[PDB]
Every structure is written in structure tokens, then in C-alpha cells.
Design a protein around this ligand. Structure first.
Ligand SMILES: CC(=O)N[C@H]1[C@H]([C@H](O)[C@H](O)CO)OC(C(=O)O)=C[C@@H]1O
Ligand SMILES: CC(=O)N[C@H]1[C@H]([C@H](O)[C@H](O)CO)OC(C(=O)O)=C[C@@H]1O
Ligand SMILES: [Cl-]
Lengths: 470, 470
């Protein structure tokens, strides 16, 4: 059996905003917390549906295990540029979240992309501006002044600082904010405002950050009810050559066994300056061994990998077919990590790691039993009456439609046997996130539209083992 | 006055190897030391005059102000691949050197390029191979093993470690090297010599280093009679995005003024993976503030540089004309650093640093009164009775011909106004290196051909100044 859909994030209708003024909801993430709570995350795309604009990172909570859901809690929404001529592209952007709970600390992390005002990924500059500087062993974000060339950093209490190293006070950027963090990056000269460092057009202040892709994180210590101010984790994980670095949205994992047990894995992907979105999309994970304090980049699956007798690297590649993008991560009972990667083979592409996410084996396994129409997927480990299984959910196709939940037995070394492919949602079907619910039940937050819904409405369903196996 | 042609590094004739079977000599570097000694350095290009093959770093000394010269002392020459099916491209390569002396320590530095077997610069791999890896960092050089993906590292005493971090113990590379350092890189299984980590063709050992460009350093404390084993400085200065990193050959300086007195400046240039040789050649310096122990990279002249309306970076640029390659550096008495860069404008190109070679000013000064036929140049600071004077020497044109010596008056602001341009050599003329001999006398080692000489024969000329004035 399978429950009827419960709509958790309701988008507007026929191009028009909903009751709150919001046209679109988008990128689902679902988390089952130690307290038994269900946390549902999404992009709140106010006016409109594209991969940019006024977008907030929002969650909702359920305590009755998915029956009823509380209020929308906004984690982060950066304030729009009020003097931008095109308001649909006139806001700093947060986009795509990953959720994970550290089982030791009970801390819940939401990691998500950040772009200043622009078209977030489809609006990146073709030239690099340095985003960060290491002054005397400490890393500070850079600022670029109008007309002037040179450093400018952000130190101490948001006190700016000239390329001279002179504490040119008057100037402060806010980073211990305050309201719902919409005032992050606000620039003051005195007690009076001015502008915001994430503003790109028609600026009322002289300072902006570098035009780049960024990676932010916020945490909750009260089961998802209140969230910390965004931590900029970018410099810990982003290399000099990297153009884009963003999350593979959905739900991350904590390793439960082997010598790296307790390691947090967050799926991510990069583009390089050689081919950007045309032929360099490359999956990897970032990880933390200290309960979310510091983060590190693992190697890309495409690093030192052989395609057609020629080795590639994610920093230099230009090959459309060899890309792998958004991914979903799972650990086996034998300690292996499997990375299910969105790609362009029409097939399920899977990478294998032996050292817990850092390095990847030579070959990408392909399963013709599971279609991939170039859309996000979620997969989870689950134990049923002995051993062992993985549950994977994505569009059946052709196109982003006919939602499928696929069931595989985990064999031996460490092989997968696809046992059944059960339809879960007819009509439009895109992004989705699976969770184990306890007691042989499972949950899913997925993208789907009906009856003129804008794109997308995010909906929840429970199901049991019978729905999966017969 | 001007002294007649005095050859130091004699090339061959009409495609014949000279007395010692060395067809070609190339890339002059001239240094006068603390004891008054002159050092002349060259590419010992044994097999041809191309930018690859079997090349040794060699010097010849003079105690008598360049009257007569001592014999050849090989700094470094890596042994050839005896199994390579083409000897002309069948050797690990060293190429281009900078000479410089620390005034306080008297240590003389030779900084030069290195490539494994191949066409060094004209034969670089299309895709990135990681060359180094931090482990409890601790940075080690990577080895790749035929048939396998995965690190392999060179650790203590040259012991090869497996990608897992297990000692192969058996496998070891020669790091403290002995002979002419010709055994550097040799790979052993115990006392069994198998091959060399710098060979890339028809290999006899299982391991090779990354196909990349490297930057090596040797030093002598005995005024140039013996030299240490090559030190690999690459990982201190070469960023991840960099394809090529190599020196602007000739002679370096030490800062004598300002808040950075004692800093050693080595001119270098980089390429990127977007356009490599076709549009990315970018001049910068590397420097040492601790007497040549540790090195750091300065920012490129092309970093955040407004050109043709747009801002570029050395890591992302594709602009042929905006390139700046080999360069020579001088400090002014007001503390400014000037960088004369080989370019493709036909003009002389000059950039200014006000923080001792790290950052560069918005603007590149073009001096039409001075020609540049896209070839290396040489410049030195020199006081004579007044203020302030710089000598710049290069080709006259059209083509690599007519050795010119130009003089400029260093104004206080501090621009420079050119006074006279005097021919020092007729015929075909290319690379050169200038020094200050004292008593208002100057010396120049340069590149020249006559009587069917293989190119080049590298000749010396001593003289002032009435040549410059009158
Ligand atoms: C940060 C961002 O833009 N993420 C978006 C992603 C990305 O643009 C694409 O993977 C580029 O190749 O595309 C999609 C999509 O519905 O297909 C949704 C994400 O919101
Ligand atoms: C590292 C190296 O090869 N240096 C060479 C240099 C280089 O190829 C060029 O600067 C690329 O544009 O070319 C020349 C030259 O004929 O002028 C001489 C140098 O030996
Ligand atoms: Cl602003």
C-alpha cells in the first residue's frame, strides 16, 4: 500500500503566485531526525521558477511522522537588490540544499549554494576574480571597490580593511546577523546603512564580493526549529581552478561502519574553466570528521579516470558524455561507498569508493535496468529481515515523468541486483528524497505538478515493503 | 669604447656538433658576485637547438673580469632514456635559468625549469595529472604505476609508498643524488636499478611522475665551483590551475630599498588550461624573504587587469595580445619594482609594483621608442653621478637581429624617459643578460650567429658608457 499525496510546498497556479506570493517551490530534501521528526527542505522560489532570483532555503517539520506539518521555517533568504532593473534576476541567490544529522551531536546541517545577484550558474563570469585571501595564515573574503583595483578583506567584526592592511574603519559588513539573516552582507559606514556586498547592479555602496559560486552551511541544535546564521565554508573545499562548486541536493549520510565511521558525506559537483557546463560537470563528496566544524574535498570520480583510452581530470575535462553531476551517496554493510550520479548515458551510473568517499575506483558501473533521463535521484540503504537492499527513486521517463522507486539487493563484492521497479507517481516527476521511517515504512518528498501547477509542488508519500517487493 | 666578440659557449657549424659533441648553446645568464667573480650560465643543448632534448645546466667562471674563463661545471644534467625510440625527444629536460646572489649570505641561486621525457612546453599533456599530495602534510611527490589509478608517494629516504599508505620498501627513488646528479630519479627495487621516474617512453620501471612542468633550484656557496643537488621548489609556488610554470631567464635581483629589503625576485610566467600557449602567457615573480629557503608566488600582472573593457585573470584568460611572458626586473630608488615583459605589441611593456613585487598597478606602460620583436630582454638598475638610469638590452629588428642597448632616465614619480639607443652587435641577435661591473663598466652575455654557426654561440662584451652617452 501507498498513501495519497500530501502537498508540503504548494506552488502557485497557471504562472500566478500562490496565497503567500510564491510562484514556485523546487529542490526537495527529507530528513528523519533522532527525535523521530521529519524535516522537509526546499527552495522557496517567490517569483518565478528558474534557477535564480529571490530564493529562500525553507523547511517544515512533522512530528506525527508525515501526517500533519508545521509552519515554514526560513533558514536563509538574502534580501533582494531594491535598485535592480530586472527583479527576477535582482536578488542574491541561495539554491539547492543537502540535509544531514550528526547522530552523535544531534546537530542538523543544511548545506546549500550561494551566488551574489545574477543568474546563479547560468550567470557566471568567464574570468576569475579571487574570492579569498590568506593574510598571515588567516583566510578573509575579498571585496572589490568600484573603479579601484586591489585586495580589500573582511576581518574581525566585519571591519573591512584596505589592501594596505590599514584598519579603514567606518566600514563594516555584517556577519553576526540578526533578523532571518536577510541583512547578511549589509554594508555600513557609520550607524547608517549604504548597501550590500552581494549586490551586483546599481549599487548604493562601493563594495562587492567576487563574482563566484559559493558554498554555505547552517545548523540546528533544536531538531530543526531554529537555525544558525550561514557559515561560509567555501574556502575549506573549493580549489583555485574550480568554477562552479555546488551540492548534489537531497539528503546526505553519516558513515555507520569501518575506519571512517562518523564521517559526514555531502554530495557535490564542480565545473572547470575549460568547458563549464558543456563538458566538465564532475561529481564528488565533501566530508567532515569533526562533527561539522571543518570540511574537506574528496577527489572527483573523473580525476585520473580513463575515458576511451585517454585519462581525464575534473579541472581540465571537456567531454559531454563523461560528466557526472548531482549524485546520491550510500554506504554498504561492507564499508564501501556507492555514488549514484546523474549523467547522460540514459543509464544508472554508479561509482565505488574504498577509503570512505575520498578516492574512487577506476570504472563507473552502469545499470541498463534503471533509466536516467538526466534528473536528480535519491537512494538509501535499508535492512529488511536479514540483508541488505538499496532503494533508489527517480523519473521513469521518457522525460521527467512516471516516478519510480527501484529496489536492489546488495550482493557480495559489492554487487547490485535490481529486483523491482514500482511506479509511485504518474504525470510530471522530477527531484525527490527518500528516508527510512522505521517499522518497515519509508517516506518520499518529490517534485510533481498537476492541474496547471507552476513547477513544482513538493509532495509527500509513505509506503511499505509490499509496495516495494510485490 | 667596446670590446670585441669573446665567445664563452661555442656552438657547432652547419649542423655539426662542436669539439665536445654539443651542437647548440642557448639562453644566457650573467652574474657578478660579491668577490667580483663573473658567472656565465647556459643551456647545454647537445643534440639540437630546440626547446627540448638532452640539455644540461652549465656555468663558466671568471676571476679576471671576463679576460679569460674557467672550464665547464655542470650544475644539473639528467641522464637520457636509453630505450627511447627517438633520442632528440628522448630525455628528461632542464631549460632556462635565472641567476641571483643573496647579499648577506653570498649564496648564489640557479632557478630553472624541468620536464620529464618529451617536448617540454611543446609536449604537455592535455589533461591534469596531480603531481603532489599532502599526507599529515608533509607534501610528497606522486608516482603513477602502469595499469593502476591511485597515488603512490615518494616519502622518507625516497621510499615509494602505495596509494593506501603502505611502504613498498623495495621501491625507492634517488633523492640525495651523487654523480652529475644524472642519477636523480633513478628507481630501485632494493639494490636493483630498474629505470627512472622521469622516463615516459618504453619504460623499464613501473613508476613515473606526473607529466607536468616543474621548477627546480640549485645553489653554490663556494662562489660557483660546486653546486648542491636540485631542490624541487614547484609545490611552494605552482597553483592547481597552472599548466606551465617557468622562469623569465637571465638574472634576478635582490631588493635593496623599502619595507621589503632583502627579498629575492625571480621573474616567471604561467600558462592556463583554457588557452595555454595561444592566449594565457602571464608574467609574474616568485620571491624569497628568508634568503632562498622558502618561496612564494606573486600575483600576475594579468590578474584583475582591465583590458579591452573587460577584466581578465591569468588563470582564465584567452587573449593573445594581452600576454606577457619572459620578463626582467629592476627596483627603483623610491622602492618601486619595474617589470619589463616580452610581449606581442611590438612595443616595450612595463608594469609597476608598490608592495615589492606582489601586486601590480592597473596599467601597463607601452614604450614605442623601444622595439620588441617578441624575444627575451635584459634590464639593470645603475647609478651614475646623478639619477637614476636603467640599461635595457634586446634585439633591434625586424626579426631577431641587431643588438641594441637602450638608456632611460628614471624620473622621481617614477616614469622613465629614453635617451639613446645604441647598436652593440650586428647580425642575428636574441637573448641577453646584463651586469654592473663597477667603475661605470658593464658586461653582457648574448646570443649570436655568424660563419654558419648552429645558434647560438653566446658571446661576451665589456664596456661603459661613452657608448651610451656619446
Ligand atoms: C544551482 C543550480 O542551478 N542547480 C539546478 C540544476 C543545475 O542548474 C544543473 O544541474 C546544471 O547542469 O538544474 C536543476 C534542474 O531542474 O535540472 C535544478 C537545480 O536547481
Ligand atoms: C621553457 C621554454 O621552452 N623556453 C623557451 C621559450 C618558450 O618556448 C616561449 O616563451 C613560449 O612562448 O621559447 C624560446 C624562444 O625561441 O624564444 C626560448 C626558450 O628556450
Ligand atoms: Cl550595494
Amino acid at each position: 500500500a501507498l498513501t495519497e499525496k500530501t502537498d508540503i510546498f504548494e506552488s502557485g497556479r497557471n504562472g500566478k503566485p500562490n496565497k503567500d506570493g510564491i510562484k514556485s517551490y523546487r529542490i526537495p530534501a527529507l530528513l528523519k531526525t533522532d527525535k523521530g521528526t521529519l524535516i522537509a527542505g526546499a527552495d522557496e522560489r517567490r517569483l518565478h521558477s528558474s534557477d535564480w532570483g529571490d530564493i529562500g532555503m525553507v523547511i517544515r517539520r512533522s512530528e506525527d511522522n508525515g501526517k500533519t506539518w508545521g509552519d515554514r521555517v526560513t533558514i536563509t533568504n538574502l534580501r533582494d537588490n531594491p535598485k535592480a532593473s530586472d527583479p527576477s534576476i535582482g536578488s542574491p541567490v541561495n539554491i539547492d540544499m543537502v540535509l544531514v544529522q550528526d547522530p552523535e551531536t544531534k546537530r542538523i546541517f543544511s548545506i546549500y549554494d550561494m551566488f551574489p545577484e545574477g543568474k546563479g550558474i547560468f550567470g557566471m563570469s568567464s574570468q576569475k576574480e579571487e574570492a579569498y585571501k590568506k593574510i598571515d595564515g588567516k583566510t578573509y573574503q575579498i571585496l572589490y571597490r568600484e573603479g579601484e583595483k586591489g585586495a580589500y578583506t573582511i576581518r574581525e567584526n566585519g571591519t573591512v580593511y584596505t589592501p594596505d592592511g590599514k584598519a579603514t574603519d567606518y566600514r563594516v559588513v555584517v556577519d553576526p546577523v540578526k533578523p532571518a539573516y536577510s541583512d547578511k552582507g549589509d554594508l555600513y559606514k557609520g550607524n547608517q546603512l549604504l548597501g550590500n556586498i552581494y549586490f551586483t547592479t546599481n549599487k548604493t555602496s562601493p563594495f562587492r564580493i567576487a563574482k563566484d559560486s559559493y558554498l554555505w552551511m547552517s545548523y540546528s541544535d533544536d531538531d530543526g526549529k531554529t537555525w544558525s546564521a550561514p557559515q561560509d565554508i567555501t574556502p575549506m573545499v573549493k580549489a583555485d581552478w574550480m568554477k562552479f562548486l555546488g551540492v548534489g541536493p537531497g539528503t546526505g549520510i553519516v558513515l555507520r561502519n569501518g575506519p571512517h565511521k562518523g564521517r559526514i558525506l555531502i554530495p557535490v559537483y564542480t565545473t572547470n574553466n575549460v568547458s563549464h557546463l558543456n563538458g566538465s560537470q564532475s561529481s564528488r563528496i565533501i566530508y567532515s570528521d569533526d562533527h561539522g566544524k571543518t570540511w574537506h574535498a574528496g577527489e572527483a570520480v573523473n580525476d585520473n579516470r580513463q575515458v576511451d583510452g585517454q585519462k581525464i581530470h575534473s579541472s581540465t575535462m571537456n567531454n559531454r558524455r563523461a560528466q557526472n553531476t548531482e549524485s546520491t551517496v550510500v554506504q554498504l554493510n561492507n564499508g564501501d561507498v556507492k555514488l549514484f550520479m546523474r549523467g547522460l548515458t540514459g543509464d544508472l551510473q554508479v561509482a565505488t569508493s574504498k577509503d570512505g568517499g575520498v578516492t574512487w575506483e577506476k570504472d563507473i558501473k552502469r545499470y541498463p535496468q534503471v533509466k536516467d533521463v538526466y534528473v536528480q535521484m535519491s537512494a538509501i540503504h535499508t535492512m529488511h529481515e536479514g540483508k541488505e537492499y538499496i532503494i533508489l527513486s527517480n523519473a521513469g521517463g521518457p522525460k521527467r515523468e512516471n516516478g519510480m522507486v527501484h529496489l536492489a539487493r546488495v550482493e557480495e563484492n559489492g554487487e547490485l541486483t535490481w529486483l523491482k521497479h514500482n511506479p509511485i507517481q504518474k504525470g510530471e516527476f522530477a527531484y525527490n528524497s527518500l528516508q527510512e521511517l522505521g517499522n518497515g515504512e519509508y517516506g518520499i518528498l518529490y517534485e510533481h505538478t498537476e492541474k496547471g501547477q507552476n513547477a513544482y509542488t513538493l509532495s509527500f508519500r509513505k509506503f511499505n515493503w509490499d509496495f516495494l517487493s510485490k
